[PDB]
Amino acid sequence: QGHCKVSLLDDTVYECVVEKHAKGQDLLKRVCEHLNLLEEDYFGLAIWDNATSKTWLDSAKEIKKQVPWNFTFNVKFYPPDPAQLTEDITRYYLCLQLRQDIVAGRLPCSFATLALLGSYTIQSELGDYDPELHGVDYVSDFKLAPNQTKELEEKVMELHKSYRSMTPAQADLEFLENAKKLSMYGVDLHKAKDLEGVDIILGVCSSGLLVYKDKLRINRFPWPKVLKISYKRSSFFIKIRESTIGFKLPSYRAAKKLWKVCVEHHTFFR
């Protein structure tokens, strides 16, 4: 208790000890200092209830109540125009996050997109293709897809071999120009039901609160139109310009979690 283990975006683990009574701010302070983090407001620390369910760490509440003391360092706020971030390092970290999102299935891509994005990942990681030193079977060390096939790796190497004088910063920019246009880019998903009992998924992103039935987007409430976001017990409420759309969440923890992310996005992207 108090021993913190934070998985960074480059898969390195950072460990520190905080006071037993520490708040989240105290741990975030340490992680941002360690990384010498330039545009740190885009990032946050997450706690994983299970393999596919996370809650962000609340900077103002004690760590002990929220959690072993294991965390991930992630992009929390995905920029809609990554080219306007000031620092190449921030673009690099955004790429590492998107690669995780791709491999986890949170950012669905067609085969051609996987191959294109994967080609830029490879260019940024290894530099220009080098037929003497790389050969013909050099991409399996990189996780480019949820299921990484030989056919995908072959397309990636074909595209990679076609590039010249592309620095990692330039590769990152091409990756991001393409990724930013994907429909799930930067979308944080939360299961819910509508009032009729129908299963839906709510997506939180820079643009607004999105509503999906299946993989199909059927509503969006942009942040400029949202007047108030609230929750009570397992109910979540959004007031728009004048009506309130309520959703039923599976627990009060889930409703609270959603409300918090929505307020944070509403504020960050004002």
Nearest-angstrom CA–CA distance, 6 and 65 = 17
Look at the block and give the residue holding tokens 């990484």. 148
CB 120 within 8 A of CB 175: yes
Across 154-270, where does the E strand assignment appear? 188-193, 199-204, 208-213, 216-222, 226-232, 235-240, 243-248
Residues 6 or more apart in contact with residue 236 via CB below 8 angstroms: 192, 202, 230, 246, 247, 248, 249, 255, 258, 259
Q: What is the CATH number of the domain that holds 154?
A: 1.20.80.10
Instruction: Report CA torsion sign: 89, 173, 51, 223.
Output: positive
The residue count of the chain comes to 270
Q: Which of 132, 149, 182 is the last residue of a domain?
A: 182
Question: What backbone torsions phi and psi does residue 164 show, to the nearest 5 degrees?
Answer: -145, 150
Domain residues for the domain of 153 are 77-182
| Reported resolution, Å | 1.8
Q: What Cα–Cα distance (Å) separates residue 238 from each residue in 129, 226, 247?
A: 51, 7, 9
| Neighbouring C-beta atoms of residue 23, cutoff 10 Å | 20
Q: What is the CATH number of the domain that holds 51?
A: 3.10.20.90
Look at the block and give the residue holding tokens 């208790």. 1
Tokens of 125: 């990681």
**What residue type is 144 in one-letter code?**
L
Q: What is the CATH number of the domain that holds 220?
A: 2.30.29.30
Nearest-angstrom CA–CA distance, 214 and 211 = 10
Residues 6 or more apart in contact with residue 128 via CB below 8 angstroms: 163, 164, 165, 166
Method: X-ray
